[PDB]
Amino acid sequence: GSVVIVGRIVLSGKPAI
Amino acid sequence: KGSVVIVGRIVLSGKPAIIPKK
Amino acid sequence: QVEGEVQIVSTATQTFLATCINGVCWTVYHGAGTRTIASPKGPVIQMYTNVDQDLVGWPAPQGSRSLTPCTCGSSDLYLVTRHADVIPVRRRGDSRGSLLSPRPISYLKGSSGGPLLCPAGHAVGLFRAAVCTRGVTKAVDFIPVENLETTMRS
Amino acid sequence: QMGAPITAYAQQTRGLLGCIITSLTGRDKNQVEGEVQIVSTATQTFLATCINGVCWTVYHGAGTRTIASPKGPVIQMYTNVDQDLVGWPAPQGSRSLTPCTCGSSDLYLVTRHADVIPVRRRGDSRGSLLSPRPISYLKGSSGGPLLCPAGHAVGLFRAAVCTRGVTKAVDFIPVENLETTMRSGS
Ligand SMILES: *O[C@](O)(C(=O)N[C@@H](Cc1ccc(OP(=O)(O)O)cc1)C(=O)O)[C@H](CC=C)NC(=O)[C@H](CC1CCCCC1)NC(=O)[C@@H](NC(=O)[C@H](CC(C)C)NC(=O)c1cnccn1)[C@@H](C)CC
Ligand SMILES: [Zn+2]
Ligand SMILES: [Zn+2]
Numbered sequence: 001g002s003v004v005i006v007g008r009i010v011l012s013g014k015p016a017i
Numbered sequence: 018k019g020s021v022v023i024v025g026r027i028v029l030s031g032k033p034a035i036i037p038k039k
Numbered sequence: 040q041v042e043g044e045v046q047i048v049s050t051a052t053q054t055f056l057a058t059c060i061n062g063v064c065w066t067v068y069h070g071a072g073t074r075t076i077a078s079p080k081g082p083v084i085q086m087y088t089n090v091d092q093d094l095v096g097w098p099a100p101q102g103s104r105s106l107t108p109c110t111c112g113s114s115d116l117y118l119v120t121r122h123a124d125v126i127p128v129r130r131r132g133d134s135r136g137s138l139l140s141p142r143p144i145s146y147l148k149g150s151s152g153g154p155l156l157c158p159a160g161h162a163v164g165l166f167r168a169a170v171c172t173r174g175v176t177k178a179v180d181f182i183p184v185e186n187l188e189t190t191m192r193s
Numbered sequence: 194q195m196g197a198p199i200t201a202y203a204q205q206t207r208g209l210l211g212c213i214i215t216s217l218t219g220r221d222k223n224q225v226e227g228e229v230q231i232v233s234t235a236t237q238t239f240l241a242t243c244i245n246g247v248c249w250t251v252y253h254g255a256g257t258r259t260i261a262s263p264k265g266p267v268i269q270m271y272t273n274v275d276q277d278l279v280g281w282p283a284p285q286g287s288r289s290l291t292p293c294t295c296g297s298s299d300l301y302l303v304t305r306h307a308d309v310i311p312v313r314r315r316g317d318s319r320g321s322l323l324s325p326r327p328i329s330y331l332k333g334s335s336g337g338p339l340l341c342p343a344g345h346a347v348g349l350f351r352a353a354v355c356t357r358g359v360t361k362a363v364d365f366i367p368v369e370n371l372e373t374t375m376r377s378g379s
Binding site: 001002003004005006007008009010011014015016017 | 040041042043044045046047048049050051054057066071074075076077082100102103106119121123154156160
């Protein structure tokens with residue numbers, strides 16, 4: 001099997017326009 | 018002669034968060 | 040837009056974390072092993088595999104950005120969990136640190152492979168395992184950045 | 194900010210042409226957020242920091258100019274040509290930083306790229322970089338803040354000591370120089 005990415009975390013706390 | 022304008026910002030207060038959406 | 044430094048990774052069994060430092064996504068061997076990461080172009084082989092230091096590394100995926108290693112030598116460290124909580128940690132050695140507020144074991148479960156930051160937000164090390172007595176964790180164990188930096192010079 | 198590690202992000206709100214029109218009209222309807230503001234006069238681009246309800250920056254960049262706000266051009270509150278300081282009332286929506294009281298010598302500089310560089314204090318208005326960087330990196334960061342381990346303001350970035358194109362040390366305006374500009378007069 002493989003290692004999948006299920007989410008991400010931003011340290012800077014950037015919201016995304 | 019002309020005014021000083023704000024072309025962007027930097028926020029220090031951003032705490033670590035999980036990026037929204039799928 | 041918006042790239043993350045920390046990835047929440049998962050295998051068929053358990054679920055842990057992965058941190059990007061210097062263009063490469065790092066995590067613990069006890070979670071991934073000799074496994075590959077999934078990408079839309081196919082499975083990607085590990086760039087580094089150091090079974091002794093409990094280290095694994097693949098090239099940084101899409102939607103990611105790298106953390107710069109610490110250069111200030113501070114002992115006031117901060118652990119980031121899988122829930123995005125920040126825990127204040129005091130450095131008690133080369134690869135050891137103690138919590139300022141002792142939390143239950145569940146709180147740290149699945150946060151392995153995550154980062155330990157200095158006051159600048161720069162990477163000091165990667166969270167490996169928690170020191171548990173009675174179900175409460177008083178301290179943490181980590182892989183320092185100088186172990187990652189030598190594994191690259193190889 | 195209050196505790197935790199110092200992490201930052203940058204957001205651009207205007208383009209070159211948008212900046213020029215609002216510099217001449219002096220009317221800025223855009224919403225303001227954050228502690229540090231990326232400022233421009235069209236020709237030169239730098240930084241501005243909010244400490245104690247007032248938006249501060251360097252005189253070598255802004256001069257005696259006005260800041261664009263939703264009600265038109267706003268005149269300066271403080272002007273200290275000798276200490277290289279300038280101040281306007283902090284824009285509506287901005288958050289201010291509290292001055293450092295811990296006396297720490299482990300400073301952290303915030304750039305225009307929203308990176309946090311480790312600095313060690315080597316005097317009243319001097320500090321050295323723990324990792325020497327190229328001069329191009331520090332350009333556009335004048336007026337930016339130097340923070341202590343708590344995230345409180347120690348001072349504002351003024352000049353870089355450059356030998357051969359690399360900067361080893363930085364020169365700043367300390368927070369106490371701001372409070373005496375508030376207590377002085379003109
Ligand atoms: O102001 C800045 O913070 C900044 O980011 N500015 C923006 C926008 C900008 C504003 C003003 C000017 O001035 P002009 O060119 O004269 O019209 C240009 C641009 C930018 O894009 O740079 C920067 C921070 C540095 C990277 N500020 C500077 O450029 C300062 C200027 C001020 C002027 C008032 C007096 C202090 C310096 N320039 C420097 O810091 C300059 N180096 C030095 O002058 C140092 C000053 C010492 C007091 C530390 N001297 C030496 O390094 C030195 C070395 N060897 C022998 C002697 N002196 C550098 C840019 C290098 C040339
Ligand atoms: Zn550091
Ligand atoms: Zn302080």
